[PDB]
From a paper:
AbApeR and E. coli KAS I protein (EcFabB) were remarkably similar. The proteins shared an amino acid sequence identity of 39% and the proteins could be superposed with an r. m. s. d. of 0.886 Å. The residues lining the cavity of AbApeR were moderately hydrophobic. The volume of the cavity was 120 Å3, which was considerably similar to that of the AbApeO-AbApeC heterodimer. The cavity volume of AbApeR near the entrance is reduced, when compared to that of AbApeO-AbApeC, because of the presence of Tyr135. Mutagenesis at Tyr135 in the active site cavity of ApeR reduces the activity significantly, which suggests that the stacking of the aryl group between Tyr135 and Phe202 is important for substrate recognition. In the model of 3EN-AbApeR, the narrow binding site of 3EN moiety led to a dead end with approximately the length of three-double-bond polyene.
Aryl polyenes (APE) are one of the most widespread secondary metabolites among gram-negative bacteria. APE biosynthesis gene clusters harbor two ketosynthases (KSs): the heterodimeric KS-chain length factor complex, ApeO-ApeC, and the homodimeric ketoacyl-acyl carrier protein synthase I (FabB)-like KS, ApeR. To understand the structural basis of the functional redundancy in the two KSs, AbApeO-AbApeC and AbApeR, from the APE BGC of A. baumannii, we determined the crystal structures of AbApeO-AbApeC and AbApeR in the absence of substrates. Therefore, the two KSs function complementarily in the generation of APE to enhance its production.
Author numbering:
A (entry chain B), B (entry chain A): 1 to 408
The structure:
Amino acid sequence: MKRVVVTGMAGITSLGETADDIFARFEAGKSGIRYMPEWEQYVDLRTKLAGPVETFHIPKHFNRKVTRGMGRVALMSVVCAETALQNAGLLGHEILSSGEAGVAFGSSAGSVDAVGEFASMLLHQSMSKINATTYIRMMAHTSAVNMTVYFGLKGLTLPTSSACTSGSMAIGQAYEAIKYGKQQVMIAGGAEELSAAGAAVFDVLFATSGMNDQPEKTPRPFDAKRDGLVIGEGAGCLILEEYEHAKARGAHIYAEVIGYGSNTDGQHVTRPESEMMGRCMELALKDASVEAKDIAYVNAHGTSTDQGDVAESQATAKVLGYKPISSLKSYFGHTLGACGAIEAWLSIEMMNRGRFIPTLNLDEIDSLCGELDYIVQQPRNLDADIIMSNNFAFGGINTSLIFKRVKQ
Amino acid sequence: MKRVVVTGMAGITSLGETADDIFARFEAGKSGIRYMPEWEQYVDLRTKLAGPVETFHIPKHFNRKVTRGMGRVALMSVVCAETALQNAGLLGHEILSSGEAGVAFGSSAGSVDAVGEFASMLLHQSMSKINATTYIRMMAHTSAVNMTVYFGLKGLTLPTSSACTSGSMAIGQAYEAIKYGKQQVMIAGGAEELSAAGAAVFDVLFATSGMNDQPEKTPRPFDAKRDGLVIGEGAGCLILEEYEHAKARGAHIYAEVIGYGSNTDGQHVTRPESEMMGRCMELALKDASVEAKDIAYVNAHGTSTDQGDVAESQATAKVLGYKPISSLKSYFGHTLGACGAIEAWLSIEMMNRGRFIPTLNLDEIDSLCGELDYIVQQPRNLDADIIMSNNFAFGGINTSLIFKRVKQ
């Protein structure tokens, strides 16, 4: 069994494209949420809040030919992955084309523009909108495929498109591929592009927030006055690497991946089950050979829905006790496929800073949520050696990831 | 490390829903390809050929409440999987809800009706078409999620939606989950529903056959006069089980899964590279600790495209040498997400019968294709102890599966 480390990290968020910039907005206490005037034209849509990425740097070599098979979600993904590879010192490295480097990546869906082209045939009886890149741009593994083609990867392609667990499932499966000796380097993460149709699927479940006139005070994970989630977009990426390989080249190491757990509720497509969420955390603890006491901080899923926040916090409290916990969805909204990767990236940053971010707009802890050490109001300084990051998605898919500090 | 066996198998195809019925149609030389008058309405669509499933049995208990989150692709998947579990003796078994049983499944896309609802907002702004099951039915992991909910699975959900490799990647990942001790039973396979938009994706690549007036003569894998693929639909499913668990209950064993290789071309998004296809077969041989000499028969991907058949057959010849080979896409067309699972199922049946099916309509072997033992005209009787089944998809995703006979 091989040990697995994180040697590169990057993300694209509504709060910025570097951890320094994002943590500066964390301290300022401002979220990426805003009212969406462009969504007034959808009359049945009750929510009008989102966390878009207004801009992100696109290097000039991402030209017309390079990006022909990329919609927004795939372009954000590949640009994010290039920054993470550059961070790791592996951009243009021989290992990328060796067969020993691969990718795990997912999103809830491909590009909605390309989905519209594919659907225009069943409606308008016309093939004129479908073109040579419609499927590449629309398909749910558009990010992973565009990455192997762009970087020339010849190892494993692991498509972990599983809605809200896409990015955490990617990290876990990439970790396993290196742990079991199949690969030496993996690009791992998730991404999602924003669309009003994406908001609609949660709006028809009455899971969205209605506070359209107060974008600055919603979503409110675990808050007694929360009224649903707000969706966002972005991308997150970790570069995972076999430990001896990383040490041999003198690489900087951000964290060690020591546990991954995943299981399934087996009950309902949308309503989570507390008991199985907690079992997933126990699977990760067992995979890491650590106990609840050894976990210093938990990054919750914490979507700000009613029964989602209750099920998660009760299970976390049952398995881990009175642990420090917070949700970054208070800042970004629910970034869907991206969330597990963005949350793992920024939680590793918290561990390396010794500074753990509170849940924004958590003012009164809901009495129906589990007894946890909710970080509120201001960042909490902790000497944390081991952290846990949890995510839960439609179909009852659960993931739990455990990361450990590395001193070099 | 655990051994992994196949204890249940099922599929739904244009040639029938039992192995006996399908093999009767093999012997008669009758494909499932037909002319599609219902596609005349799409004027820009050049191909008018497909391999639809006209009917399959749906048990009574699949009522409207049970199937409200299933489109056609998911219903075929769940029905197929129930039949496979029945075959294995595990339907309703306590292990299914124990946490030790899971699912690996994929398709190229979810239900096209649901994709249309999702695009009603993108196109006509009218939201009266999105409902509470639109995403569950449209999403590319609709089969896997519907199966965990329907059967009460609490183990791993492994979404392997990777276009043409969905079903083979599901078998391989399910096999690894058992081999590495994470699960004791896995439902594994793939599925696809037929749609004109799916044909158009290949039509615009000039990859489809235009022999619309001769459906009984096309597709023609490896044939000197082939002119592209024809798409089909269906589902395939294997029940994989840890070997000691199967033996302890006296289960019938159809095969042992002994090797899985997967890699990526890293060069082109639609045109496969021969060298990496061969490396993928080498990965499978190494995983199985067998040599080229030990492979008795190869079930080709064999889509009947110009460049695809040459790259695949040249790779096979280079890495395996002169081997018996045939393509079942000559009977079903290219069933996309289903193809790797249907082809694994029926190849295991060939092994158990000692009778290996010829490529239909392969009348003049292309001298540009590799030097192989192409089975033509009549089935070949073989005392085959080990077989290989290969699949290659968009994004240059390659899979190779090795199965071994089990004498009980």
